[PDB]
């Protein structure tokens, strides 16, 4: 029928006569007088001087009439050019120390500005530029950069905010993506996104309304304008105290648009850049009209950065495939490949990694099988992700053939701008702001993953966060009070304490070999607890610690600590093949050695290595069949280096290092610690389970004038998953010196400690003079170099 007086309007239980929402235009239809009654743009979006005090003229877009404030429709300037108050953005700004809402609100309102495409270098162009976005930046709390999550598209990210959830898990894992079990693709454009058997997950939206919170509709018609979408925020929030919603929702689509067109680094960003501060000051000014600007939580939180990427830079996978007609390629700042599914498709998923591997010099992108992708992607777990991934260098492009570059009829491309890349690279991370009652006054917090942040905004409204992958907790710095009280959560498997019980007589099956007071100089952070139930035994010895496991015949955790001055032995020839019984472990609980023999493709190592030992008796214990794991001899060369010669390395720079190291086991990639049941590979003939990576978590002072032992104040954590693979293909240079390539494999596949903590069921830090809540954010740290 009639959009009469019900312009953008939340009807749940019924709308009368149409559809007359935010989303109408796109989605669906609308009533016919929605143009005129809900779009109106007479006189424009500001108060003129000659308009002051005007007889309610309907048809304008705002009203400048002395009612408007009454109905909350006036023009974002009116106070400012027809009362004589001054601007948002010239007050300055007062530290808020409780929310100022009006009388029949029920918690402080929490509005998300969301910015597509804000590259947190942005920030550095100062007041000229951005003076609203620089007063909420240095008066609110900010990070540096905020760390979206992989791949740093649109849609992953914006829906991995509102869910908290990894790409992997809420089922958004691109802007273009297939699902073999609808048999369909998604897209940015078309109506097959708005199909809700896309979105897995708990968005925030919908969060809120199952708790009883309202939510204002989140989203917008393309051809709403921007200046629309902030007076219909403004008018909502003047709703009565039954209706109005308590948390909003606003998106731009710049500077991606101009960043795309221009690149980051083009004089022309500073003209979006002014008018999405233009919209912000919009909005405060609509605030303060409002008396809402110390009230409402405001987060100013963007998608991804911007690279400068060209036509020019693109590699082409017609280089290095003989046919890629019989694949799809989902192509730009990543790689996706699947197969066409024809008849005779004819297609090998390790060939085609084969044929990507390392094949020109300057190669600017890498094939990965996604289980073998770095873990702290988690991007390898879902059945819209293809198997084949490919790792793009940053200012680059993949493409299928030459004949999909579209530039321009000039010599000259169409874009100067893209994203899309791993989510370490720098110039992918994006802004997080956040101002408001609740948010901390002229603090700044260190950057962070994005996928902490529903957590964060669930707190900020009261709400019971769905089922996620933040942990809850690790953000607590960044808000004044309403804060999550995190538990350390309770050991399930509780450890044995053998002592000598075996006569070494029934013992050395195939092998052979020519407490607790000294070793808590080696476990300076607690023994890791185990969260599920098993039976292993703590081993205790002069220069490290152990947790075995009799299930898995090998420890869980290794933990040893080394001076900044300590020494690096060889191994002694008379001793390079030792293995010795462990005389508190039964035979029937340890490994042997006959299963390394008859397995030719399997040897092992040691978790702590041989090379660090003390004296030359205490050497003897790092030779022990507990200490021994089972290890690819390509595996090796990465294990060997990092124990002999970057151990010491780190150990001189950081004044000591205390490092903890262990198996890890996920065939099912999912994740999360496999159950024994989801082992798929031991060693031959034996029981004896294959890890599938190898952890370590190397923690010192951050203060490096106190050694690591003795260390008052917060840790430095660098912790990494290194795949246990049977080659090292994914080192193009491993051929060379390992002071070549070792070190940036190990940069590569930097891993959080909780995402360790994931792999494992071990939880670390239990013992240590921090809060709780810091030592939550220390495990959530991302050490990417
Ligand atoms: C990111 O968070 C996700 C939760 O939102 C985690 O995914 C969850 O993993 C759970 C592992 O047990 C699944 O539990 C299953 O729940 C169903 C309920 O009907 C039951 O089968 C079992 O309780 C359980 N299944 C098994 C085999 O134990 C959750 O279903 C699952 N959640 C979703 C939404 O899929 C991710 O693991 C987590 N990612 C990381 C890296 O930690
Ligand atoms: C590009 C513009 C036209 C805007 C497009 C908006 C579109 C992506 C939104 C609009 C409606 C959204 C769904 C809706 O809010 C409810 C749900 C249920 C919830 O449990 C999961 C998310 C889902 C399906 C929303 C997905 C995003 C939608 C389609
Ligand atoms: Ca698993
Ligand atoms: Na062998
Ligand atoms: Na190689
Ligand atoms: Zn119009
Ligand atoms: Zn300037
Ligand atoms: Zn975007
Ligand atoms: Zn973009
Ligand atoms: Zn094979
Ligand atoms: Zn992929
Ligand atoms: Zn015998
Ligand atoms: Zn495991
Ligand atoms: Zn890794």
Same mark, same amino acid.
């Given at each position: 029928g009639s959009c009469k007086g019900r312009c953008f309007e939340l009807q749940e239980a019924g709308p009368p006569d149409c559809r007359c929402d935010n989303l109408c235009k796109s989605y669906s239809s609308c009533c016919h007088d929605f143009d005129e009654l809900c779009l109106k743009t007479a006189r424009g979006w500001e108060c003129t001087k000659d308009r002051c005090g005007e007889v309610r003229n309907e048809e304008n877009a705002c009203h400048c009439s002395e009612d408007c404030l009454s109905?909350?429709?006036?023009?974002? *300037?009116?106070?400012?050019?027809?009362?004589?108050?001054?601007?948002?953005?010239?007050?300055?700004?007062?530290?808020?120390?409780?929310?100022?809402?009006?009388?029949?609100?029920?918690?402080?309102? =929490?509005?998300?500005?969301?910015?597509?495409?804000?590259?947190?270098?942005?920030?550095?162009?100062?007041?000229?530029?951005?003076? *609203?976005?620089?007063?909420?930046?240095?008066?609110?709390? $900010?990070?540096?950069?905020?760390?979206?999550?992989?791949?740093?598209?649109?849609?992953? *990210? =914006?829906?991995?905010?509102?869910?908290?959830?990894?790409?992997?898990? $809420?089922?958004?894992?691109? *802007?273009?993506?297939?699902?073999?079990?609808?048999?369909?693709?998604?897209?940015?454009?078309?109506?097959?996104?708005?199909? $809700?058997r896309w979105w897995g997950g708990q968005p925030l939206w919908i969060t809120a309304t199952k708790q009883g919170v309202r939510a204002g509709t989140f989203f917008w018609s393309v051809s709403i304008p921007h200046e629309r979408?902030?007076?219909?925020? =403004?008018?909502?929030?003047?709703?009565?105290?039954?209706?109005?919603?308590?948390?909003?929702?606003?998106?731009?689509?710049?500077?991606?648009?101009?960043?795309?067109?221009?690149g980051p680094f083009g004089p022309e960003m500073t003209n979006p850049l002014r008018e999405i501060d233009k919209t912000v000051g919009q909005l405060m000014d609509g605030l303060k009209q409002l008396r809402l600007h110390r009230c409402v939580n405001v987060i100013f939180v963007g998608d991804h950065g911007m690279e400068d990427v060209t036509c020019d830079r693109t590699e082409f996978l017609s280089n290095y495939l003989t046919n890629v007609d019989d694949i799809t390629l989902v192509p730009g700042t990543l790689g996706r490949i699947r197969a066409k599914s024809i008849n005779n498709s004819k297609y090998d998923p390790k060939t085609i990694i084969a044929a990507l591997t390392c094949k020109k010099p300057d190669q600017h992108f890498k094939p990965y099988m996604k289980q073998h992708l770095p873990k702290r992607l988690h991007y390898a777990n879902n059945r819209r992700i293809e198997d084949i991934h490919l790792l793009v260098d940053r200012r680059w492009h993949v493409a299928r053939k030459p004949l999909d570059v579209y530039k321009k009829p000039s010599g000259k491309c169409f874009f100067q701008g893209d994203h899309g890349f791993d989510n370490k690279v720098n110039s992918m991370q994006t802004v997080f702001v956040g101002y408001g009652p609740t948010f901390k006054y002229r603090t700044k917090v260190p950057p962070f993953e994005n996928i902490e942040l529903y957590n964060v905004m669930c707190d900020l409204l009261g709400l019971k966060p769905a089922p996620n992958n933040g942990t809850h907790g690790s953000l607590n710095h960044l808000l004044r009070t309403n804060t999550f009280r995190p538990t350390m959560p309770d050991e399930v498997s509780r450890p044995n304490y053998p002592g000598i019980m075996y006569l070494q007589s029934e013992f050395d099956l195939g092998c052979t070999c020519d407490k607790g007071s000294a070793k808590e100089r080696h476990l300076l952070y607690g023994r890791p607890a185990v969260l599920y139930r098993t039976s292993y035994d703590i081993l205790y010895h002069t220069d490290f610690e152990s947790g075995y496991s009799e299930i898995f015949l090998m420890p869980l955790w290794t933990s040893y600590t080394i001076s900044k001055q300590a020494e690096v032995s060889s191994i002694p020839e008379h001793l390079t093949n030792c293995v010795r019984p462990d005389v508190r472990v039964s035979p029937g609980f340890s490994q042997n050695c006959l299963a390394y023999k008859n397995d030719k493709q399997m040897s092992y190592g040691f978790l702590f290595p041989p090379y660090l030992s003390s004296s030359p008796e205490a050497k003897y214990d790092a030779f022990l069949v507990t200490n021994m794991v089972p290890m690819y001899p390509a595996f090796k060369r990465v294990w060997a280096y990092f124990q002999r010669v970057l151990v010491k390395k780190y150990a001189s720079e950081r004044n000591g290092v205390n490092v903890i190291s262990g198996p890890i086991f996920d065939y099912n990639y999912d994740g999360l610690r496999d159950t024994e049941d989801e082992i798929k590979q031991y060693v031959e003939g034996s029981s004896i389970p294959v890890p599938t990576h190898y952890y370590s978590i190397i923690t010192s002072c951050l203060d490096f004038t106190q050694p690591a032992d003795k260390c008052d104040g917060p840790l430095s954590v660098s912790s990494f998953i290194l795949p246990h693979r049977p080659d090292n293909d994914e080192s193009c240079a491993s051929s060379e010196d390992e002071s070549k390539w070792v070190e940036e494999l190990m940069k590569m596949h930097t891993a959080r400690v909780r995402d360790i903590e994931h792999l494992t069921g071990l939880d670390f830090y239990r013992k240590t003079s921090r809060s709780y809540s810091e030592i939550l954010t220390l495990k959530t740290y991302l050490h990417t170099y």
């Open positions: 109905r909350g429709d006036c023009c974002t *300037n009116y106070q400012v050019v027809c009362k004589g108050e001054s601007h948002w953005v010239d007050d300055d700004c007062e530290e808020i120390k409780v929310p100022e809402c009006p009388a029949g609100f029920v918690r402080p309102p =929490l509005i998300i500005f969301s910015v597509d495409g804000f590259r947190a270098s942005y920030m550095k162009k100062g007041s000229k530029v951005m003076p *609203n976005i620089e007063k909420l930046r240095s008066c609110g709390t $900010h990070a540096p950069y905020m760390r979206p999550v992989y791949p740093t598209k649109t849609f992953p *990210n =914006l829906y991995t905010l509102a869910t908290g959830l990894y790409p992997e898990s $809420h089922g958004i894992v691109g *802007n273009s993506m297939y699902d073999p079990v609808f048999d369909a693709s998604f897209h940015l454009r078309g109506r097959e996104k708005f199909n $809700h979408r902030i007076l219909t925020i =403004l008018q909502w929030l003047s709703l009565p105290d039954n209706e109005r919603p308590s948390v909003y929702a606003f998106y731009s689509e710049q500077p991606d648009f101009s960043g795309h067109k221009y």
